[PDB]
Amino acid sequence: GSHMKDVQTETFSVAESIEEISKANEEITNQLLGISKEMDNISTRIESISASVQETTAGSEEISSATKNIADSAQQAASFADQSTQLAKEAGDALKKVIEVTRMISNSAKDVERVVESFQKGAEEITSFVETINAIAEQTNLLALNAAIEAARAGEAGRGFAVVADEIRKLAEESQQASENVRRVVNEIRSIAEDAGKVSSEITARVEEGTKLADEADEKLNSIVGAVERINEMLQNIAAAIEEQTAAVDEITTAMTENAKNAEEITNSVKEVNARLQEISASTEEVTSRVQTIRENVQMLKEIVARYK
Amino acid sequence: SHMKDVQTETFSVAESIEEISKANEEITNQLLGISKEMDNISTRIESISASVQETTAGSEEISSATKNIADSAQQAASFADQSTQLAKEAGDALKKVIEVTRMISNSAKDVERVVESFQKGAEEITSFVETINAIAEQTNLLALNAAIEAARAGEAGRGFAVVADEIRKLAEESQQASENVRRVVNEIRSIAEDAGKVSSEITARVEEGTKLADEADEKLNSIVGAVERINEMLQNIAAAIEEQNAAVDEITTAMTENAKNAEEITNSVKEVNARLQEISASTEEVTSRVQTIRENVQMLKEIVARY
Ligand SMILES: [Pb+2]
């Protein structure tokens, strides 16, 4: 009696307990389903993260190639800056030596007023020397004609006097013709002498206007040098940017190989996780199959209580 | 007698609780491995996040540099402009020196002409020395000839011996003017040879003034070529600047998703770790009920003997 009424109380508790194990094991199989969906999310995301790595490598490759173009285009631009700097120092040295030439044009052209006025001096000098010869001539002429006219008034012997006096008068007026000719040339000499002072004033004016006008290009040449040394200063800043770019691109490629090495280990850990889950599912399967061998046996004790008890 | 089926049933319920316990132990061990493998995904993820920040930072200064280069280049482009403008004038002020030069080259031509009119003006003037002198020496002899006979006639030579005399004397003054002219013409003649240098030392010195200015000419168009290569070279970096900005835009958008996915993974580790904890609990629910059945399978084997 109490021998079977306890065999019942007993099988009541085990039938009651095994049923809790069945749901505790049902709760477990569910959690396993959720874990998998999360393991696949890791997997899928670990695939996109891997794709994120390829895009970037492409960017480091474009950047580098781009920084190489910039490092070379600049390395060559700077070289023309020294060529422009040299053609400047050169064009500078040339132009400053044209002034030296123009300054020699100063003293050398100066020696001209000595010449223009030395000839201009032979004006009243020669003109007065000639004006005197005119006076002498017209006086010999009047003097000569007077003997000739006065001598002729006597007669016989006056013939002889009138002849010589008249030939002297003829020569007297030959000197007057000579003097009126030596005059036109001394007057021409005048203009060609005076109108010449007008050129000494033009060459001196053109010496100064052309000389300082040369030193306008010299400053302009100086300004390109400055302009060019600023350009070089600019290429130099560009070198430094390039250096920063080469360093920054590198640390990026290291950070990117590091991602491939970490995404791989997650993929492998996910792999290990999945296996471990497939083994959890195994043991969970063994509890389900054994919850049968207990329930069957827990109600097989029922018909033994109905009879014996 | 039938405590036959009590034993055959209290035998099976003892042989199964035995496997549940074992299955529950396998479950517990695996659970401990997953947590372990789980906490490792966390570490690698933290490391992936760092790489993302290192890349973003790297990608950022890559941008500062690109802008810095874009600016520096722009400015250099200006300076080259300021340079070409000065190459227009450097050539300009010279297109003025060649014209000032050709003006003075001709003003120098004016002088040989001057000096030529003087040399000719002096050779023509000497024949007048010759002519006047001659005429004066003829007048002299003639006036002497008149005196050597005017005194003769009779008391009629009175005024004729007087005139012949002053004629001779007048003719003696003409010799003087000529000798003084001869003196000055000579001074004038030597002026010509002295003037020679200034005359051609000019076309000579203006000549090489033109040479030096023309060398500065070529040395100057050669810069507009040198500064032309620089613009072309500078033009090659502007084009590289568009790639870099594009390259940083491709890199930022990549790193942007990589940040998302890293969070999406961390968030998944969080779910799993919590789900694992629910099963540990379920594992314990089972380990507690394994005991209750053992007691209830032991108290039953007591019946097997008792009865
Ligand atoms: Pb850095």
Ligand SMILES: [Pb+2]
């Ligand atoms: Pb198992």
